[PDB]
Design a protein around this ligand. Sequence first.
Ligand code: NAG
Ligand code: NAG
Ligand code: NAG
Ligand code: NAG
Ligand code: NAG
Ligand code: NAG
Ligand code: SM
Ligand code: SM
Ligand code: SM
Ligand code: SM
Ligand code: SM
Ligand code: SM
Lengths: 639, 639
Amino acid sequence: LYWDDLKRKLSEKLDSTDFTSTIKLLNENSYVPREAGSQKDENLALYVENEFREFKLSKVWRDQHFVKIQVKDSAQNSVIIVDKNGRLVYLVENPGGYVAYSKAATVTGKLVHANFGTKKDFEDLYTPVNGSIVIVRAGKITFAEKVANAESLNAIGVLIYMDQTKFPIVNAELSFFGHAHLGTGDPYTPGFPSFNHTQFPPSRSSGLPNIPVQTISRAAAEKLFGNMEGDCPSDWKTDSTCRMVTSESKNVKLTVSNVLKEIKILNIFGVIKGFVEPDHYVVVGAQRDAWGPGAAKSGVGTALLLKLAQMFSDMVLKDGFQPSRSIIFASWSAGDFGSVGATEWLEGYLSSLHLKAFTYINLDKAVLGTSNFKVSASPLLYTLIEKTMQNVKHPVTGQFLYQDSNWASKVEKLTLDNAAFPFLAYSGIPAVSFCFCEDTDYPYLGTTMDTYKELIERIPELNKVARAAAEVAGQFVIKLTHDVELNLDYEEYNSQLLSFVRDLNQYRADIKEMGLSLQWLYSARGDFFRATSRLTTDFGNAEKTDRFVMKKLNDRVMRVEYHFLSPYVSPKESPFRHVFWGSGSHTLPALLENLKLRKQNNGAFNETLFRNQLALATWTIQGAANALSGDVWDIDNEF
Amino acid sequence: LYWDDLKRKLSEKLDSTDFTSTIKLLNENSYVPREAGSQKDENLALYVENEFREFKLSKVWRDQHFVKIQVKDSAQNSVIIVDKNGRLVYLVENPGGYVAYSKAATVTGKLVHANFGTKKDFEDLYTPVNGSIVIVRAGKITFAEKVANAESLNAIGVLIYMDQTKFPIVNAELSFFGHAHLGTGDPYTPGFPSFNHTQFPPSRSSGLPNIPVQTISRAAAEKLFGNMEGDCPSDWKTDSTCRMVTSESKNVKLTVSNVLKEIKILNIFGVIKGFVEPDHYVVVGAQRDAWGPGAAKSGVGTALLLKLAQMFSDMVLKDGFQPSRSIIFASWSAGDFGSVGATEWLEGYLSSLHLKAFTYINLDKAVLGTSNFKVSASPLLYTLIEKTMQNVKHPVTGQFLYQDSNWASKVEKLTLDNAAFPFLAYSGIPAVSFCFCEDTDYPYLGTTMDTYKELIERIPELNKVARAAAEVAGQFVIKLTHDVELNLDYEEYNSQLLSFVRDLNQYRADIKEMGLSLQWLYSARGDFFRATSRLTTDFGNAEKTDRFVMKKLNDRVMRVEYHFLSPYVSPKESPFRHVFWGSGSHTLPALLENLKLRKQNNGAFNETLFRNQLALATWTIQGAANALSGDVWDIDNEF
Ligand SMILES: *[C@@H]1O[C@H](CO)[C@@H](O)[C@H](O)[C@H]1NC(C)=O
Ligand SMILES: *[C@@H]1O[C@H](CO)[C@@H](O)[C@H](O)[C@H]1NC(C)=O
Ligand SMILES: *[C@@H]1O[C@H](CO)[C@@H](O)[C@H](O)[C@H]1NC(C)=O
Ligand SMILES: *[C@@H]1O[C@H](CO)[C@@H](O)[C@H](O)[C@H]1NC(C)=O
Ligand SMILES: *[C@@H]1O[C@H](CO)[C@@H](O)[C@H](O)[C@H]1NC(C)=O
Ligand SMILES: *[C@@H]1O[C@H](CO)[C@@H](O)[C@H](O)[C@H]1NC(C)=O
Ligand SMILES: [Sm+3]
Ligand SMILES: [Sm+3]
Ligand SMILES: [Sm+3]
Ligand SMILES: [Sm+3]
Ligand SMILES: [Sm+3]
Ligand SMILES: [Sm+3]
């Protein structure tokens, strides 16, 4: 069949699927407080597993894992205002929720208020946090980062609250759940999978806080500010009530007693074997666990995952759809702790997944509103996101998703808190991640209020919306399979690479003071450009009939993304090796970020570090080229 | 054509080729002291380059490189006996040769004599080297290692001489050339290629001595012993004359002044495009540089390389030979310093070469005698070495190379000093390396005596011998290409892996004292066995006509070797990642080697180190499995 056919079919199928029901079903007490590794968790897990079986799809299995999660100890965690001795006022509060992987300790001192988790940026404010507890708003960044920065400035203890402006929740006595791990997955099995506790049981600090972090209710925040002299700025796009520093007269004490708890995570798979490249998959995932009932955090996703798997299987058996490449749906678990489920899976194919999975879609938090349509992905999926937003019509507005007034659409970078991030920054798999987002992030998100009710009370046509999300997700799959040519934008990296070279040339001056020639970089950038130009040519000259010549090409395409992961850094040390989207000194952005410091004439600039950064970052790109063809044995022997 | 045809043809072609002439030609003053990066060097380089062109073979190019080599400074290096002052005795000797990368310094003190470069083993002798110069024989190990151990025991300065028993050279006034780098290639570009000196110019110590090392003439050795009280043991399979320690009355002073010198290495290639898998090569290399005239060290090799390239091209054009996979001959340079030429080439395709080269043959030191026939290679080429030694008849003896009295032949491990080692231990390419060796290693090897004369004076039928070597080398190539199925023994690794498990079970006791379950390892070993069993099956069921299904299989085979390189260690830190043949704590052998120390009840055993060693070494094997198939998504979801 042809695209129109698949597009049309997939639509009517989407026209007759109740997503709202399943989003509700995944709310019955049968599986409501489906915490990570809980019974409910395991309940829904088997539900999905069976549903897949019922869907009559091909092979479907389970993925067991034992990771260390952190939970609230029997001893109560609390915040209390107290002078250089005893609590005068009252125990601010005994927080109802907590920040996982938080340093298990208790300390007291001054209490500064660095708007939006310091943002790392905001830390450049007047009052110093040099040895004092800090308050921050839940927002622009992730707790992990908020805390990380706080501690990088030598602070201790961090409180996170949901202000009124950012979080318009009527109830101010509401508490939410946190993360705190500056990474992805179990924080003791970096790059390699985990085992028992009995075996390989290190404690922590392997990329974990080392500073107590506690989530606080707005109400509690109110009271804290009540005992603070300083006055909150207008710079902070907030609203009155907060201070900046506690009234000297007295300080505050934070006490968090949390304990590690080995649980058994259960990932559930299920594929749909392809017909020509049966061994090249399109991983479609969806977080299944959640702290509260997580109708949004986990409902909509799993809801889509199921309904979406139900369709393709059907299409394959009844409608004649013959996906040239297999599809593999996966419902991860222990996701509230950093995609621990999906990550440790990847951890499992540390150097082969890219040979198998060529793209990872992600349905998490797919429906959160009806205004915007945020989209984050690897440039390799740029044109797919585009052309698809040109085929899918907004659920509310009768118009298409794509803003016809531009030629350059907006695509966001994947964040440390998105299961898709690991797939791309660690496993080198290109990944997309859409969201029918809103200017303001869903409030009830990390709290017990993520109910199917308060959701649909806030998004009336949730069905139509989820449908759309299920449609863009569907087309991605049809598209990434329908045709024999693996359609990934390996060109977009030329641009991505040129942009770097450009930004780097703004320091040609600094580059000159240092003996650096910066010539080898251009060569790489070019040696790579050709590589793509050949591939982009060889394709055109090859016939969509020679299963062999095509397979040889598609494989080259399939290498592109993975090969941009620094082959000079160990996964065990720095898991996000992707020079473009990773995190670490190997990061391309990180290079400029160090060089910028050169001008500051201070010591902030580590020259030896740069020298290497450039040196390697060059050979990384270079290699990416020699790997992406050049007909092998690239013959630019001159230079 | 069929094997017999190719075998028969290749033979008569070998029957009519004067190898002796070319081994001589490569001795004319036109290119005699062809040191690394010298003019002569560059001369022969262009000779080979043109010869290849003349051979009318397909593409042929050059490979430029700027590595830092070490050379003898204008200031003379010398050894002189002297007391706590007053430099008594005659100027023992101003050594004619030198040990590259040796620490540039000068020191004096006691002089111990640790037979055969300490061997690391021999260091367990009576007299301590704790702060004193040391003497060693050139033998069992490499200078690099000899020195390394010496310094690990806190010694300073090391002299290397060629004793009479081991080196039956009439002339005792003869001096030889050394190495000293405990690695492979330029010692400042570990894992990543080099640049200019102007750019990235670190000094050294990046895996280099830090202790002066000087080669000494037997004559000089004589004199040293002359001023020594101790008496040489019979344990040392040597002969009279040497002592153990200098006569207390006085000591010796070593002064080495060498300087680094950026040179331009020139690797010369030339391929023979295949007909079905044109992009899967069989790298056939041969060191081209040398200190002395190196007729053996470099002549015979380059001699074969040329003559061997001359044949296949001819066979392809005239005889109808249609290699299903391309052949690529390569004459490296700067090889006397650690395969610096070939290594930095590999350094170039840090993560893709295995996707290109599926086997590396090596002609270096192919002819050195006529008695034995040593052979070193990766178990993946075991059956080829075997079946071939069953087809090639010894040049002297009319009988076949293969000892018919066994079913299990002897194959040696690749050493740090073999261009093939890097290909296998660093790039993950299976590599063979034969030698018509002798019980005693060629004496003139590292000295100005490696002449075509003294050679043929010591091996009369050098032509027939070289011919044989050129024949086993030839069949390897014909065999690795003739057929459509990539013939590599990926099975032999099951054995190789089981042997490990076995040897490891001898410590099940220790493994038990520690909470270790050691169960995950068996699973991997097994999860891998199945993998090979499927591949070994899929092949049988596939037809040598479906270029597609075969390509998909051969590729899997082509992954086998590379995937045993610890994906948890950085090439920049530990370049030889191969868990089996590499070097480092990631090494499989290294694991046992640490565990053995457990019993010693002392602290020598690092438990935390083991814990990881096992942990990762497990996932390494595991991964090797998940990468070698299991039909993708290995479904041993239970466990
Ligand atoms: C850091 O903060 C402490 C108070 O905790 C203060 O005494 C000190 O002056 C600040 N700066 C330094 C360098 O210690
Ligand atoms: C992992 O630990 C759990 C509980 O400690 C146990 O049930 C399970 O059998 C262990 N798995 C292995 C492979 O030892
Ligand atoms: C500078 O970077 C090099 C290499 O990354 C490192 O060895 C050194 O400790 C760093 N120095 C500082 C001040 O960061
Ligand atoms: C090491 O050698 C020195 C002589 O250089 C000697 O004085 C000392 O006793 C030896 N052992 C130690 C532990 O220093
Ligand atoms: C490398 O250095 C040599 C001599 O310093 C010079 O001839 C050559 O052009 C340099 N190469 C580059 C790329 O700068
Ligand atoms: C033991 O090994 C661990 C990890 O390899 C290392 O951190 C530690 O320093 C080692 N200790 C000793 C005494 O070797
Ligand atoms: Sm982990
Ligand atoms: Sm309401
Ligand atoms: Sm180039
Ligand atoms: Sm190097
Ligand atoms: Sm003679
Ligand atoms: Sm298994």
